[PDB]
């Protein structure tokens, strides 16, 4: 009973590195550094605030998942009478986070870590597990979030290539119209920077990409 | 749709939980297969007509230990067998064996090894059998 408080404070201290790895903050942060880099701006818009705007959307999506943990764990009947039922209770408490990892992680990248951990565990003689586990068996919580964080780096770079495209189509035609004249000794990025800013403010990519990311996890009406 | 004339189970790369649940009708009790003993696989044409005799033979060919406690059938693999030694200050082993024989948890394949009128013995078996024998032995001295 007293050491349940030790387990609470020890969970409390390791919290922001879980937000650093486990949640979807890793999708917003990467694509927001990429929209800064593709525009050519280096310091602005001062990424200390870009962490904050990327954090607030991730909290805005993560709130219904984390809220059921409070109502499940502030129950007055946490304490059971058997040692295996009490260890069963924290599993069925952790299942709402765990199937969230299942929905948004990759299939084979998760599947690679169980085979890699078992041959470390017993030895080479352990036979490999295939895709067909998926209908009944659940993986561990420590074999998911590596393959989760790699799959989300894959999806964030998937998004980051696409809106990198409409700026380099601008950056090649400016470097060609300057060489249509004899203006070879001229820095084309200082002419390219206004029409790079117009193609983002006339298109208004912030207020439709921000809706796009919330549509990639949740729905409306 | 399923043309075979006789009766039997055909397993193609079954994974030892779907195999024993198909035997869980000829056996009239539900079967609980452990986590380490569900990684092994079996395939072939099988048939069940006395499964209490078939389970003993397949628990030696595959390498398994099983226990039936009146309500269910627990199945573990061979590398999960655990051992214990306990001391009784004021009851005998022959008194505890009458409790096990009269209640119905006495298993003649895994008997209790010890002196006939003492407090110490040696028990070994499945993990659901040992933690019951130890828990009832330390719950009769505190009662007496």
């Amino acid at each position: 009973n007293d050491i349940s408080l030790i387990a609470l404070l020890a969970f409390s201290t390791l919290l922001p590195f879980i937000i650093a790895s486990g949640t979807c903050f890793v999708k917003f942060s990467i694509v927001f550094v990429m929209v800064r880099n593709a525009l050519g701006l280096q310091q602005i818009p001062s990424n200390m605030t870009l962490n904050g705007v990327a954090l607030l959307l991730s909290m805005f999506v993560m709130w219904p998942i984390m809220h059921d943990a409070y109502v499940y764990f502030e129950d007055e009947d946490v304490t059971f009478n058997d040692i295996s039922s009490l260890s069963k209770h924290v599993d069925e408490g952790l299942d709402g986070y765990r199937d969230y990892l299942i929905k948004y992680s990759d299939r084979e990248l998760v599947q690679f870590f169980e085979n890699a951990q078992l041959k470390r565990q017993y030895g080479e003689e352990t036979e490999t597990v295939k895709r067909d586990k998926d209908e009944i068996e659940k993986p561990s919580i420590f074999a998911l979030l590596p393959a989760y964080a790699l799959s989300e780096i894959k999806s964030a770079f998937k998004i980051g290539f696409y809106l990198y495209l409409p700026f380099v189509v601008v950056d090649l035609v400016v470097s060609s119209v300057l060489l249509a004249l004899g203006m070879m000794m001229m820095s084309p990025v200082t002419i390219s920077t206004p029409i790079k800013l117009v193609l983002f403010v006339a298109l208004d990519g912030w207020t439709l990409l921000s809706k796009g990311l919330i549509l990639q996890y949740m729905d409306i009406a | 749709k399923i043309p075979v004339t006789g009766s039997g189970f055909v397993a193609k790369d079954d994974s030892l939980r779907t195999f024993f649940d198909a035997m869980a009708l000829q056996l009239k009790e539900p079967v609980i297969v452990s986590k380490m003993a569900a990684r092994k696989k079996i395939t072939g044409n099988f048939e069940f007509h006395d499964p209490n005799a078939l389970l003993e033979k397949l628990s030696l060919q595959l390498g398994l230990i099983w226990y039936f406690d009146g309500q269910a059938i627990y199945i573990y693999d061979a590398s999960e067998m655990r051992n214990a030694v306990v001391s009784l200050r004021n009851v005998s082993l022959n008194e505890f064996n009458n409790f096990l024989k009269r209640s119905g948890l006495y298993n003649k394949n895994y008997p209790l090894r010890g002196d006939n009128r003492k407090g110490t013995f040696y028990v070994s078996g499945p993990p659901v059998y040992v933690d019951m024998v130890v828990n009832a032995a330390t719950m009769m001295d505190k009662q007496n």
Partner: peptide
């Protein structure tokens, strides 16, 4: 249907289409 599947034939026949899927046919 029963190419890679495991099934029980006889009186109460069923086809396990998957480790988590049963199919009960009506004869």
């Amino acid at each position: 249907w029963l190419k890679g599947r495991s099934f029980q034939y006889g009186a109460e026949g069923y086809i396990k289409m998957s480790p988590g899927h049963w199919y009960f046919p009506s004869p």
